[PDB]
Paper text:
To assess [name]+4 as a possible matrix lipid for MP crystallization and a crystal delivery medium in [name]-[name], we employed the G protein-coupled receptor [name] as a model MP, considering that MO-matrix, a 9:1 (w/w) mixture of MO and cholesterol, grown high-resolution crystal structures with ordered lipids have been reported. The results are summarized as follows.The [name]+4-matrix supports the growth of X-ray diffraction quality [name] crystals and serves as a crystal delivery medium in [name]-[name]. The structures of the [name]+4-matrix grown [name] crystals were determined at 2.0 Å resolution by SS-ROX at the cryogenic temperature, and at 1.8 Å by [name]-[name]_4 °C and [name]-[name]_20 °C, respectively.
In the present SS-ROX and [name]-[name] experiments, we employed the [name] crystals prepared at 20 °C. The samples for SS-ROX were flash frozen in SS-ROX_cryo, and those for the [name]-[name] loaded into the injector were kept at 4 or 20 °C during the measurements in [name]-[name]_4 °C and [name]-[name]_20 °C, respectively. On the other hand, comparing the [name]-[name]_4 °C and [name]-[name]_20 °C data obtained under exactly the same conditions, except for the sample temperatures, the [name]-[name]_4 °C model seems to be more reliable. The reliability factors, signal-to-noise ratio (SNR) values, and average B values for [name]-[name]_4 °C are slightly better than those for [name]-[name]_20 °C. Since the diffraction data could be improved by lowering the sample temperature the [name]-[name]_4 °C model is used for further structure comparisons and analyses. On the other hand, at 4 °C the fission/blowing-off frequency of the “stiff or solid-like” [name] stream was reduced and occurred less regularly, tending to form an [name] lump with a larger D4 °C (beam on) as compared to D4 °C (beam off). To summarize, the [name]-[name] data collection at the 4 °C sample temperature could be performed with the higher “% indexed images” (32.8%) as compared to that at the 20 °C sample temperature (18.5%), and yielded more reliable diffraction data. Therefore, the use of low temperature [name] samples could be a useful option for the [name]-[name] data collection. Although the majority of the extra electron densities are rather obscure, we noted that five extra electron densities on the extracellular half of the [name] surface can be assigned to two different lipid species, cholesterol and [name]+4.
Author numbering: -1 to 208, 1001 to 1042, 1058 to 1106, 219 to 307
Write the structure that this text describes.
């Protein structure tokens, strides 16, 4: 067989290339949030926590991955730390992505409550807690769910390790039942499915809010035409009562309020006329509503549509991040599933293991590109930093 060092050199070179790009791109994310007060919101606190996890992939996880690829002699608990530390960073990533999804869900479902439910101070506490939980989940093998008690004596003696030491190889020390049931099913797949469910609920909420606006609009316009071609007070009365309901629903910022005050007032004026049986004076009064609609209501309608469209576009941007996370991490998990559940199956070849590892690391490069391409405030701030400071 080809000398192992040849394939190792290609692996190490690619890992270091990923490390540099993971560090530089994610430092730029953090720098941008620092510089630009417009990026300093709770959602971006989770973005920075995720960027920190991706920097730590370049600074620590990749060097650990290079180290463990050599099968060097190590005390089994030191070996476990090096093997498992990336699981902490990946778990931290999952918690940040989950927090972002829920943050955007609260923002679209209860916008008025959002700013007092979701504060900076609560976000900082949630981020600290998520990082502690990530250490506990990812280093669970150090608490005794490990293969340190069943060492590979053949490998130990062939590598010439001293006593207490193992040839530090991931699949020799980390149990595959931990990797498949606990890490993959419980800690990764379940949160990814929850995130899918939350984004689905975001898109369903946006669409139902957009449909309700458009229906309120149409209720207004249709009742305006019912009133015109009407033939008695009871017709005009019914249509006006519908419009009034629709108008109070649409309402649920001074120039905004003035607009709906004019509209509802005009409706109520045309409502009192109708009740007195004055059909033509009611109908005339209702013709006033058209200029109020054109001048105030159509403006609020279009601002509300535009806001919802921006929230959908932002939610799409953030969901793409979750999909690339899944794309980058699932192959390694699926390989572990084959290793674990198919003992009759040939183990995935080494080159495929290392490709899946490298792909998982590439996840720590991509998010800065998604922010630059999809989010104007990031793109513009990256431009300022690159021009001014490079
Ligand atoms: C990647 C680059 C773009 C940026 C990196 C930045 C800097 C700070 C990286 C820091 C790297 C260190 C944290 C790496 C630690 C390396 C350790 C894990 C090596 C362990 C090897 C060891 O213990 O020696 C082997 C023998 O002692 C053993 O066989 C017998 O005990
Ligand atoms: C994020 C996505 C949109 C794009 C990501 C791009 C992905 C596909 C990364 C591209 C890199 C690869 C084309 C090149 C990697 C080749 C590596 C994995 C070869 C490994 C060879 C190998 O087996 O080396 C290790 C062993 O030989 C042994 O020596 C132990 O070190
Ligand atoms: C501030 C940052 C850079 C600190 C980084 C500290 C890291 C590199 C330290 C902390 C714990 C250390 C490990 C502790 C125990 C062992 C077992 C020994 O048999 C081989 C070395 C090994 C595997 C060490 C490698 C280096 C290590 C992982
Ligand atoms: C998430 C997207 C990108 C899909 C990726 C699916 C990947 C992980 C799938 C596609 C085909 C799969 C391989 C098909 C056949 C075998 C041979 C078996 O003896 C070991 C596992 C192995 C080598 C599988 C491992 C996982 C595999 C490489
Ligand atoms: C993508 C997300 C949503 C779903 C994850 C699907 C995973 C868990 C599925 C996809 C393909 C599946 C594998 C397909 C084939 C085999 C070979 C069989 O002898 C043991 C089970 C095993 C190894 C399956 C395990 C579970 C598996 C890896
Ligand atoms: N199975 C596995 N192996 C490794 N590295 C060892 C690759 C290998 C596998 C077998 C072998 O004989 C020599 C090397 N890193 C790994 N990282 C992960 C991982 C992280 C998150 C999910 O899976 N799984 N995983
Ligand atoms: C991109 C900067 C330079 C790239 C590094 C060159 C890679 C050569 C290092 C080889 C060291 C091999 C150590 C033992 C590996 C054997 C694993 C089975
Ligand atoms: C907001 C700042 C980030 C806070 C990070 C602090 C994390 C400290 C380490 C966590 C301790 C948990 C220990 C559980 C694992 C023990 C296994 C030996
Ligand atoms: C298994 C689900 C994975 C699906 C991937 C979703 C991503 C869609 C990509 C379209 C938008 C990408 C924007 C910029 C791409 C830059 C990539 C480096
Ligand atoms: C071997 C290092 C892998 C780095 C791959 C990361 C891909 C990032 C996407 C960049 C696309 C840039 C397109 C510009 C037009
Ligand atoms: C401020 C962080 C600097 C870290 C420098 C440490 C480099 C580690 C090199 C390990 C060499 C191991 C030799 C084994 C015989
Ligand atoms: C920053 C204050 C410390 C956070 C306390 C975390 C609460 C942990 C409760 C249950 C731990 C379950 C860990 C799973 C192994
Ligand atoms: C054989 C070495 C195992 C060392 C474990 C000692 C530390 C206890 C773990 C407490 C974790 C609490 C974190 C909060 C969830
Ligand atoms: C998202 C679906 C998750 C369910 C996957 C469970 C697969 C279990 C495979 C059992 C294989 C047992 C092999 C015995 C011969
Ligand atoms: C990085 C995930 C996609 C990898 C696509 C490669 C598919 C080839 C799999 C064949 C491996 C068969 C070897 C078993 C003997
Ligand atoms: C309000 C913006 C502050 C930016 C926080 C920067 C955190 C960087 C920590 C990275 C840790 C990697 C070793
Ligand atoms: C703007 C407040 C967010 C602070 C997030 C910083 C996270 C740093 C954790 C570093 C742990 C790396 C090992
Ligand atoms: C006594 C030799 C093996 C013990 C492993 C210690 C690993 C955990 C300590 C690292 C500290 C984290 C910063
Ligand atoms: C600058 C970062 C380089 C990565 C550190 C390499 C550590 C390999 C140690 C080999 C174990 C014997
Ligand atoms: C370390 C400061 C940031 C420098 C930015 C240079 C370009 C970053 C490229 C993103 C992969
Ligand atoms: C576990 C991650 C959930 C974080 C939720 C986001 C903010 C909620 C504060 C009330
Ligand atoms: C593999 C399931 C998670 C995918 C989430 C992507 C959201 C569009
Ligand atoms: C339904 C799970 C039982 C199969 C266990 C497979 C472990 C090799
Ligand atoms: C990048 C592809 C890896 C090499 C495939 C076959 C090596 C035996
Ligand atoms: C210059 C870094 C070399 C990688 C370790 C063999
Ligand atoms: Na990450």
């Amino acid at each position: 067989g080809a000398p192992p060092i040849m394939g190792s050199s290609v692996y190490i070179t690619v890992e270091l290339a990923i490390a540099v790009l993971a560090i530089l791109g994610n430092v730029l994310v953090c720098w941008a949030v620092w510089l630009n007060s417009n990026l300093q919101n709770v959602t971006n606190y989770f973005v920075v926590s995720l960027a920190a996890a991706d920097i730590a992939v370049g600074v620590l996880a990749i060097p650990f991955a290079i180290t463990i690829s050599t099968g060097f002699c190590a005390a089994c608990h030191g070996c476990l730390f090096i093997a498992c530390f990336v699981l902490v960073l990946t778990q931290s990533s999952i918690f940040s992505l989950l927090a972002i999804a829920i943050d955007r869900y609260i923002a679209i479902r209860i916008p008025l409550r959002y700013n007092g439910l979701v504060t900076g101070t609560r976000a900082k506490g949630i981020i600290a807690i998520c990082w502690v939980l990530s250490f506990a989940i990812g280093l669970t093998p150090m608490l005794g769910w490990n293969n340190c008690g069943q060492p590979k004596e053949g490998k130990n003696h062939s590598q010439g390790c001293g006593e207490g030491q193992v040839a530090c190889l991931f699949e020799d020390v980390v149990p595959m039942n931990y990797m498949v049931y606990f890490n993959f099913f419980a800690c990764v797949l379940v949160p990814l499915l929850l995130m899918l469910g939350v984004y689905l609920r975001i898109f369903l909420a946006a669409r139902r809010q957009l449909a309700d606006l458009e229906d309120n609009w149409e209720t207004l316009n249709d009742n305006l035409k019912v009133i015109e071609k009407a033939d008695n007070a009871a017709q005009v009365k019914d249509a006006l009562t519908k419009m009034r309901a629709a108008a109070l629903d649409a309402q649920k910022m001074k120039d905004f309020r003035h607009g709906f005050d004019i509209l509802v007032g005009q409706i109520d004026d045309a409502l009192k006329l109708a009740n007195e049986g004055k059909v033509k004076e009611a109908q005339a009064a209702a013709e006033q509503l058209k200029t109020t609609r054109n001048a105030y209501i159509q403006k609020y309608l279009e601002r509300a549509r535009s806001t919802l469209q921006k929230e959908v576009h932002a939610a799409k941007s953030l969901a793409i991040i979750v999909g690339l996370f899944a794309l980058c991490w699932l192959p390694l998990h699926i390989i572990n599933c084959f290793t674990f559940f198919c003992p009759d199956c040939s183990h995935a070849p080494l080159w495929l293991m290392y490709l899946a590892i490298v792909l998982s690391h590439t996840n720590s490069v991509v998010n800065p590109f998604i922010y630059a391409y999809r989010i104007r405030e990031f793109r513009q701030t990256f431009r300022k930093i690159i021009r001014s400071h490079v």
